[PDB]
Amino acid sequence: HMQLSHRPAETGDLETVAGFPQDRDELFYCYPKAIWPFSVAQLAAAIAERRGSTVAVHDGQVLGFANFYQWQHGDFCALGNMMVAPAARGLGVARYLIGVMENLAREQYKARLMKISCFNANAAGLLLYTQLGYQPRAIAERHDPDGRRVALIQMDKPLE
């Protein structure tokens, strides 16, 4: 059914990907420095500051997006901006794209570790990363757009 492929993100993908977050909570989980409503400009700003922006495609549709927000050659990468089209949630897109990013971190950055940080309210993410072999290492305090304290669960996984 799901026949996923991947390639580097392109300008022509921005409007699609900027359509993915469906509410302020979803935007905060995947891009906590963004301001609702999301926009192509905000997405392009991230892409410029980051590395490895990659889309996942199925049946001619861009269904996922991810990048690295930290990269340290021979050391680790940290995954962020993981977004999935609302019509394709729970179909394997995030897990597919995390595997692609793991490979890119190993191959291009010679990373030994991938870091993922997940906000506490994002249960789906915490469970998914757990299923993929990520372990929690620390919890950091952050604040949401209403000034409320949230917990950022910092996880990692050795790259094999």
Ligand X SMILES: O=C(N[C@H](CO)[C@H](O)c1ccc([N+](=O)[O-])cc1)C(Cl)Cl
Chain positions contacting ligand X, by CB under 6 A? 20-21, 26-27, 29-30, 41, 44-45, 48, 82-84, 89, 94, 122, 124-125, 128
Backbone conformation region of residue 76, classed left if phi is above 0, alpha if psi is from -120 to 50, else beta: beta
* DSSP sequence for 59-105: TTEEEEEEEEEEEETTTEEEEEEEEE-GGGTTSSHHHHHHHHHHHHH
CB of 103 to ligand X, least distance (A): 18
CB 60 within 8 A of CB 98: no
CB atoms within 10 A of CB 17: 23
Q: Is 84 annotated as a binding residue?
A: yes
Q: Is 1 annotated as a binding residue?
A: no
Nearest residue (CB) to ligand X, 42 versus 76:
42
CB of 133 to ligand X, least distance (A): 14
Binding site, by residue number, is: 6, 30, 58, 82, 84, 90, 92, 94-95, 122, 127, 131, 141, 143
Binding site for Zn(2+), by residue number, is: 6, 58, 141, 143
